[PDB]
Design a protein around this ligand. Structure first.
Ligand SMILES: Nc1ncnc2c1ncn2[C@H]1C[C@H](O)[C@@H](COP(=O)(O)OP(=O)(O)OP(=O)(O)O)O1
Ligand SMILES: Nc1ncnc2c1ncn2[C@H]1C[C@H](O)[C@@H](COP(=O)(O)OP(=O)(O)OP(=O)(O)O)O1
Lengths: 508, 86, 309, 96
């Protein structure tokens, strides 16, 4: 049986949290902790951070080190802390075995935390806070743009002891990843039924009305769940895809969500639920983290780390990290970036839309130079397959799918992201000239006059020349306004510096 | 002869341009070192010397941390006094 | 008596340890170490290249007393040797059910959804297993062929694996499991062993042992050893080496691949003089049926199948 | 019901014995212990004596002093010892 310190160590923290601080002690036998290690820990601002980052470092090491660490505390003034931890041996508390077992049945999700992840702190920390509290009808969303590792931060907190004890070692996972129409729901619902009890008689009749039928199950469930011990459980729903759907599972308590689509996180309201957003810039992949993550794939010294900063999304970060440990891209090459997986994920991810009504329309969006803003008024020109106010109708109809438009909400639209761009190769055939050319529509009207011209916002000063890229060069060399001193200065007009006599701290 | 660092409350690394067509801009936004007496730069640029009113040592890395403890470490105000030895 | 009985029901696997094997030491020894420890959710892989006698070292340790007592004389064998698609799984799963208790009512409805159906069985199993005495058991899985599959049987405790395919031993991670590799040179057939094994077939004095060192794989070693006790090859002849069995084993062993997409491609590899290394850049020339980066795509797509690259 | 520190204090010692020594701490707010008091304690040769003579001194005093003493340990580096002793309130262990 005999347990192993790194198995058990994670259990008791609070005691270990409160009355002890890492900074108190750097004895630092070098094998057991590197210098950079404890260099990093103390930098945390508080115990709940401080004590925490300790464990995650230790548990990433081979047992000998830990096996020595439980001894090392003895030599420190305080051994009182390590006498309990020595109740590993022949004394897993009759509770604790429940835990130390179950996380394994959680790790038998395998790949997931098997090799790859580096924790996180902020998104973790807010969540445990909330998910510790909620009482038996509530919710916590987790919203993120494609990838952005919600399904993981989902798990990881659900692994941490103090949670697992709060909820009585009952945690049920599902996937709505394919959920549409009544039929499918019945399935991915009916599975949930078996996990709770391995007895269900068909007794409620097989009557061909599918709509009725679930509402019988959903009944039989609702009672059973809140009825007995099983009083505190939580469902978890990964990749909720139907705004209904949801209403499938309403009956329960303590459930938890993950969702791409805007229309879900909008459908819920802060009254009965909380939020965790992973887009909010404070929540996402401290560049120090990317080092650790991008490390575990390449298996090379920090001198071998990439320079120039690639992105923070865990998805698309792995594909890079993976493509190098095996395939091409040299880690220095990458333009191609393993298009297939990147595609095969991004491709189906767009499968939701009305193809001619909509999927035609992204193809247009390749017109735009990346990362900028696009005036909605300008957007009116591109399609002209459907007409008039449909523009704002479109973006909305588009926007509801997660940032596939990416609203700025001032007189414009914003790039959905690198991803839904990054995919491929605009194609679009005839489009280029007339679409790039005719979208020059604005200026040639205004040429030379008094004072300050009616010239369009902050988009034209930047990329108007890009649209020239598809046009006649002499015709641009005329109007490229290298020649024209009037228009030209008005670019850097808006441009100032936050600081000193230079550019930026605000704007170049 | 690549960059030029300048700042007050921003603790930001900026760029220096030498006559020639090409120029460079950069943003940094380091954590606040504010209310230091003076500032300098080291030779290998991987180390940054910093001193405070009451005194302290804070190191930084230009590639995109303070102990007053042990010996001495008295409590008092630090003067402008400082220098480099061999 | 529980023990001394059961090993017999283990030897009634017959051929296996009936006549042929000579033990081993190292691969044995590491394994008992691990397999003595693991608590009721864990794994031990056993990885080996084709043949290389994993299925045996598998058994042999499971025969040794001190194990057999640790696990309470309950050891259940399966074969996923044919496991694909939901249907088959249901079978080779449903068998396992009977061995545990000879009572199972169909009661969970026969509803035509195969996907649902197992997930009912797999439930009914999961409770029963960890429930009662039967608290410490181990499944054993020989020749896990579907990277799923696995996920068929997850519910249990103490299970154990054998796998050719790279993609399995990669899919698992040292966090929740250990490894035993049989390729690792320290693990494999001390040339002194080959003497003992190659002995029991030929039944002749050590003066009659082969000289020049043939190979260490138990598979393909037997075929030699067998072909001599009966058929041709003189023990001095062997170029032919009983191609059929050698073929019939190796042939189906390649049956996994996309035939025109891939099985065309081995045929190319015969270009190469044996045992060397081949520059991947050089590899680009040979096929030229599919183009450009597909080379590295191929080898990978190939490599995942055990050292077929 | 409510129990009273000098009632309960005598229960747990071993913990209080092992990992703590009186000599470690003379903070000595004078009302709670006289000088001669702690003058005498440290003179003992070992914890099993040392920790012990502590209690017998305390339990000879009025509850206020003790009532302050259970607080006084907090200010000392180690409060970990006094969190259990604060399980007096509404938690006499079903044994105790
Ligand atoms: N903490 C993490 N550390 C390292 N890699 C991570 C982390 N979180 C996610 N990843 C990477 C590794 C995972 O293999 C990859 C899988 O994508 P995933 O995180 O599951 O996205 P997601 O499921 O949360 O959103 P989506 O549904 O769009 O995939 O994401
Ligand atoms: N310890 C052993 N001693 C003697 N012969 C052995 C030994 N192990 C394996 N062999 C030989 C004899 C067996 O008849 C022959 C059977 O192949 P086997 O060991 O079952 O391969 P394997 O099943 O472990 O891998 P594979 O699935 O590819 O066959 O291998």
């Amino acid at each position: 049986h005999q347990y192993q310190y790194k198995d058990i160590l994670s259990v008791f923290e609070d005691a270990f949290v409160d009355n002890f601080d890492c900074k108190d002690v750097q004895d630092m036998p070098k094998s057991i902790l590197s210098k950079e290690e404890i260099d990093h820990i103390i930098m945390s601002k508080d115990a709940v951070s401080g004590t925490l980052r300790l464990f995650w470092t230790l548990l990433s090491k081979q047992e000998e080190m830990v096996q020595k660490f439980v001894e090392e505390v003895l030599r420190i003034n305080y051994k009182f802390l390590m006498s309990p931890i020595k109740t590993e041996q022949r004394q897993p508390s009759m509770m604790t075995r429940m835990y130390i077992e179950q996380r394994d049945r959680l790790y038998n999700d395998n790949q997931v935390f098997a090799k790859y992840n580096v924790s996180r702190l902020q998104p973790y920390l807010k969540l445990r806070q909330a998910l510790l509290e909620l009482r038996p009808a509530k919710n916590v969303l987790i919203d993120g743009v494609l990838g952005s590792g919600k399904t993981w931060v989902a798990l990881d907190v659900c692994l941490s002891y103090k949670v697992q004890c709060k909820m009585d070692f009952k945690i049920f996972w599902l996937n709505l990843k394919n959920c549409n129409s009544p039929e499918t729901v019945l399935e991915m619902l009916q599975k949930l039924l078996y996990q709770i009890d391995p007895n269900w008689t068909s007794r409620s009749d097989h009557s061909s009305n599918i709509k009725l039928r679930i509402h019988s199950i959903q009944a039989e469930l609702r009672r059973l769940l809140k009825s007995k011990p099983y009083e505190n459980c939580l469902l978890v729903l990964l990749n909720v895809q139907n705004a209904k759907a949801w209403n499938a599972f309403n009956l329960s308590c303590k459930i938890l969500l993950t969702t791409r689509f805007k229309q879900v996180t909008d459908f819920l309201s802060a009254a009965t639920t909380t939020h965790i957003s992973l887009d909010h810039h404070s929540m996402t992949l401290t560049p120090d983290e990317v080092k650790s993550l991008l490390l575990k794939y390449l298996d090379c010294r920090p001198q071998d780390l990439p320079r120039e900063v690639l992105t923070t999304n865990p998805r698309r970060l792995s594909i890079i990290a993976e493509s190098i440990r095996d395939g091409l891209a040299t880690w220095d090459n990458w333009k191609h970036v393993n298009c297939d997986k990147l595609t095969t994920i991004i491709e189906s991810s767009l499968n939701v839309l009305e193809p001619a009504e909509y999927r035609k329309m992204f193809d247009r969006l390749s017109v735009f130079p990346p990362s900028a803003h696009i005036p909605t008024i300008l957007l009116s020109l591109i399609w002209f397959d459907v007409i008039k106010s449909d523009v704002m109708v479109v973006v909305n109809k588009l926007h509801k799918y997660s940032l596939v438009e990416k609203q700025p909400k001032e007189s414009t639209i914003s790039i959905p992201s690198i991803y839904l761009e990054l995919k491929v190769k605009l194609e679009n055939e005839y489009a280029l000239h007339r679409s790039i050319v005719d979208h020059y529509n604005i200026p040639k009207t205004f040429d030379s006059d008094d004072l300050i011209p009616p010239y369009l916002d902050q988009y034209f000063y930047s990329h108007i020349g890009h649209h020239l890229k598809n046009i006649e060069h002499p015709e641009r060399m005329t109007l490229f306004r290298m020649v024209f001193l009037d228009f030209r200065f008005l670019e850097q007009k808006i441009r100032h510096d936050s600081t000193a006599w230079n550019a930026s701290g605000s704007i170049l | 002869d690549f960059c030029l660092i300048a700042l007050a409350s921003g603790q930001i690394l900026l760029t220096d341009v030498s006559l020639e067509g090409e120029d460079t801009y950069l943003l940094r936004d380091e954590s606040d070192s504010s209310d230091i007496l003076r500032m300098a730069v080291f030779n290998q640029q991987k180390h940054l010397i910093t001193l405070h009113c009451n005194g302290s040592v804070k190191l930084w890395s230009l590639w995109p941390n303070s102990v007053v403890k042990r010996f001495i470490g008295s409590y008092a105000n630090l003067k402008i006094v400082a220098f480099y030895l061999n």
